Design an enzyme around this catalytic site. Structure first.
Site, PDB file in Angstrom:
ATOM      1  N   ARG A 119       0.843  -1.221   0.000  1.00  0.00           N
ATOM      2  CA  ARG A 119       0.000   0.000   0.000  1.00  0.00           C
ATOM      3  C   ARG A 119       0.871   1.262   0.000  1.00  0.00           C
ATOM      4  O   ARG A 119       2.063   1.207   0.420  1.00  0.00           O
ATOM      5  CB  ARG A 119      -0.965  -0.001   1.193  1.00  0.00           C
ATOM      6  CG  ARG A 119      -0.289   0.198   2.545  1.00  0.00           C
ATOM      7  CD  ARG A 119      -0.361   1.621   3.103  1.00  0.00           C
ATOM      8  NE  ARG A 119       0.425   1.676   4.332  1.00  0.00           N
ATOM      9  CZ  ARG A 119       1.766   1.806   4.377  1.00  0.00           C
ATOM     10  NH1 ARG A 119       2.475   1.982   3.262  1.00  0.00           N
ATOM     11  NH2 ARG A 119       2.384   1.789   5.549  1.00  0.00           N
ATOM     12  N   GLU A 164      -1.608  10.110   8.094  1.00  0.00           N
ATOM     13  CA  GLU A 164      -0.434   9.407   8.669  1.00  0.00           C
ATOM     14  C   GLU A 164      -0.481   9.484  10.196  1.00  0.00           C
ATOM     15  O   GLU A 164      -0.784  10.546  10.734  1.00  0.00           O
ATOM     16  CB  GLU A 164       0.880   9.968   8.124  1.00  0.00           C
ATOM     17  CG  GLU A 164       1.882   8.875   7.714  1.00  0.00           C
ATOM     18  CD  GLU A 164       1.467   7.852   6.553  1.00  0.00           C
ATOM     19  OE1 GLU A 164       0.957   6.762   6.895  1.00  0.00           O
ATOM     20  OE2 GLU A 164       1.754   8.084   5.347  1.00  0.00           O
ATOM     21  N   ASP A 189      -4.222   6.120  12.497  1.00  0.00           N
ATOM     22  CA  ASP A 189      -5.067   4.886  12.515  1.00  0.00           C
ATOM     23  C   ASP A 189      -5.299   4.421  13.971  1.00  0.00           C
ATOM     24  O   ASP A 189      -6.447   3.974  14.325  1.00  0.00           O
ATOM     25  CB  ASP A 189      -4.559   3.794  11.561  1.00  0.00           C
ATOM     26  CG  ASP A 189      -3.168   3.223  11.832  1.00  0.00           C
ATOM     27  OD1 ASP A 189      -2.380   3.855  12.560  1.00  0.00           O
ATOM     28  OD2 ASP A 189      -2.880   2.128  11.289  1.00  0.00           O
ATOM     29  N   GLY A 244       8.476   0.832   3.280  1.00  0.00           N
ATOM     30  CA  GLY A 244       7.398   1.737   3.724  1.00  0.00           C
ATOM     31  C   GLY A 244       6.054   1.488   3.040  1.00  0.00           C
ATOM     32  O   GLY A 244       5.078   2.201   3.393  1.00  0.00           O
ATOM     33  N   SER A 248       5.108  -4.281   3.131  1.00  0.00           N
ATOM     34  CA  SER A 248       5.415  -5.691   2.760  1.00  0.00           C
ATOM     35  C   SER A 248       4.771  -6.660   3.765  1.00  0.00           C
ATOM     36  O   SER A 248       4.194  -7.679   3.309  1.00  0.00           O
ATOM     37  CB  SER A 248       6.901  -5.950   2.668  1.00  0.00           C
ATOM     38  OG  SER A 248       7.581  -5.406   3.795  1.00  0.00           O
ATOM     39  N   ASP A 296      -2.970  -0.786   7.133  1.00  0.00           N
ATOM     40  CA  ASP A 296      -2.153  -1.565   6.167  1.00  0.00           C
ATOM     41  C   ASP A 296      -2.920  -2.887   5.801  1.00  0.00           C
ATOM     42  O   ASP A 296      -3.270  -2.915   4.649  1.00  0.00           O
ATOM     43  CB  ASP A 296      -0.733  -1.753   6.686  1.00  0.00           C
ATOM     44  CG  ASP A 296      -0.063  -0.424   6.968  1.00  0.00           C
ATOM     45  OD1 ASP A 296      -0.687   0.648   6.643  1.00  0.00           O
ATOM     46  OD2 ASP A 296       1.053  -0.448   7.509  1.00  0.00           O
ATOM     47  N   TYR A 347       8.229   4.471  16.746  1.00  0.00           N
ATOM     48  CA  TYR A 347       6.796   4.176  16.469  1.00  0.00           C
ATOM     49  C   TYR A 347       6.095   3.953  17.813  1.00  0.00           C
ATOM     50  O   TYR A 347       5.266   4.755  18.216  1.00  0.00           O
ATOM     51  CB  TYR A 347       6.621   3.049  15.446  1.00  0.00           C
ATOM     52  CG  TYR A 347       5.191   2.807  15.004  1.00  0.00           C
ATOM     53  CD1 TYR A 347       4.318   2.059  15.780  1.00  0.00           C
ATOM     54  CD2 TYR A 347       4.682   3.347  13.813  1.00  0.00           C
ATOM     55  CE1 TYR A 347       2.999   1.837  15.380  1.00  0.00           C
ATOM     56  CE2 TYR A 347       3.367   3.129  13.395  1.00  0.00           C
ATOM     57  CZ  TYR A 347       2.521   2.371  14.184  1.00  0.00           C
ATOM     58  OH  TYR A 347       1.222   2.166  13.788  1.00  0.00           O
TER      59      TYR A 347
END
Ligand SMILES: O=C1CCCC2=C1C1(CCCCC1)N=C(Nc1nc3ccccc3o1)N2
Ligand SMILES: O=C(Nc1cccc(Cl)c1)C(F)(F)F
Ligand SMILES: OC[C@H]1O[C@@H](O)[C@H](O)[C@@H](O)[C@H]1O
EC number: 2.7.1.6
Length: 390
Positions: A36, A42, A45, A137, A140, A185, A235
């Protein structure tokens, strides 16, 4: 000449070849889940906010067949996978459950199997492949999780909901890959549709499929070809932080909190914390607008909101890196570009540029004015999880 043309017929071919060579029979089954790009929204979520991803033609294919012996046999051919390319392991039980470890690529598949909500789950053989650049990014990990999920549903159909399979994939990411992600994602790998973005409400889990009809406008995903040390590490810090603000503000999330409410409350929360909620709460608004703007099909206000999104992620949330700033700042100074910004979790990976397809050969000539290696994808908005039977 830096542009990686997707080759999805070749991806499936490669996969079928490697399988018959590895296991001695033609595989019964093919599934795909895409990578994606997140166009805007950004680090919203997990704050129960709004996100506007679309699915890429870059994907992860399983090809494989059920087994009678209750065990799993995986071969990966992905270029950058960590050794070994092959792991086998018994299905979990009440007794024994799968454990994450070595190799890591195998942890995502393990994860999904361990949390797969249906039974009886028979053992399989599968070749795993991917045109999603690993740690680049473009998700995957979500393509492989949702690819695994999709292959498992053919072995043992679930009687469940999209959200439920997203959650399952998301649990595997958390438990088995140690990555406490949200659902953008996974959702997008599941629910993406060709020529659409997917406006995901992460409070209600209501979804909207937004046409990207206009063939003039296109999107240049530019790989920075760096994944800085602080990515893995910063993160969860951001999340913990967002959590404390909501905690201190008596807000069930930052979604419910609105910017007029935070401005007043500068001093209820931390200084660090206040400069970050400004992004979330703000971001959420600009994803709504970008949404409403896309329906109106103002390619221009794409920019204001998309370029503003970068500034906010760079100055306020602090999850950019010079390489991104210079790809963004390089793009947003080119005529024929509505706008550009870091996409996904940051500290490296890709920028995303809303530009006129006419100037595609000019932008890819210009960028690769970048102090680093640039890889280019010209991204059709693409299909989600797909089964093909062999
Ligand atoms: O170390 C990191 C940092 C976080 C992001 C990222 C990785 C590694 C973990 C596994 C070994 C390579 C690097 N892998 C992915 N892998 C994703 N890997 C796949 C392998 C085969 C098929 C589809 C795949 O999707 N993402
Ligand atoms: O974003 C795109 N097109 C677009 C068209 C009108 C307004 C906006 Cl904001 C965007 C895409 F995906 F088709 F390239
Ligand atoms: O917009 C930030 C995004 O970062 C992604 O890489 C992550 O997997 C998503 O859940 C979301 O947090």
């Amino acid at each position: 000449a830096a542009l990686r043309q997707p080759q999805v017929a070749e991806l499936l071919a490669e996969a079928r070849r490697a399988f018959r060579e590895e296991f001695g029979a033609e595989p019964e089954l093919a599934v795909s889940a895409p990578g994606r790009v997140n166009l805007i929204g950004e680090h919203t979520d997990y704050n129960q906010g709004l996100v506007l991803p679309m699915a890429l033609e870059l994907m992860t294919v399983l090809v494989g067949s059920p087994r009678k012996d209750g065990l799993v046999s995986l071969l990966t051919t992905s270029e950058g996978a960590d050794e070994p390319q092959r792991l086998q392991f018994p299905l979990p039980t009440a007794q024994r459950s799968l454990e994450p470890g070595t190799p890591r690529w195998a942890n995502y598949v393990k994860g999904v199997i361990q949390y797969y909500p249906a039974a009886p789950l028979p053992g399989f053989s599968a070749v795993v492949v991917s045109s999603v650049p690993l740690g680049g990014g473009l998700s995957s990990s979500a393509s492989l999780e949702v690819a695994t999920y999709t292959f498992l549903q053919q072995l043992c159909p679930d009687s469940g909901t999209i959200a439920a399979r997203a959650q399952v994939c998301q649990q595997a990411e958390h438990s088995f890959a140690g990555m406490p992600c949200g659902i953008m994602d996974q959702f997008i790998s599941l629910m993406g549709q060709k020529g659409h973005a997917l406006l995901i409400d992460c409070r209600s889990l209501e979804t909207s499929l937004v046409p990207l009809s206009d063939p003039k406008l296109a999107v240049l995903i530019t790989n920075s070809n760096v994944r800085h040390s602080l990515a893995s590490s910063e993160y969860p810090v951001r999340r913990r932080q967002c959590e404390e603000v909501a905690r201190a503000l008596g807000a069930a999330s930052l979604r419910e909190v609105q910017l007029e409410e935070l401005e007043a409350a500068r001093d209820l929360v931390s200084k660090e914390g206040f400069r970050r909620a400004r992004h979330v709460v703000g971001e959420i608004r600009r994803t709504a607008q970008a949404a409403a703007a896309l329906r109106r099909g103002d390619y221009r206000a794409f920019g204001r909101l998309m370029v503003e999104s970068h500034r906010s992620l760079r100055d306020d949330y602090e999850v950019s890196c010079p390489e991104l700033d210079q790809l963004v700042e390089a793009a947003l100074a080119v005529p024929g570009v509505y706008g550009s910004r870091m996409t996904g979790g940051g500290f490296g990976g890709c920028t995303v540029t809303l530009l006129e397809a006419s100037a595609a050969p000019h932008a890819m000539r210009h960028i690769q004015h970048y102090g680093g290696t640039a890889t280019f994808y010209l991204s059709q908005a693409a299909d989600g999880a797909k089964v093909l039977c062999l």
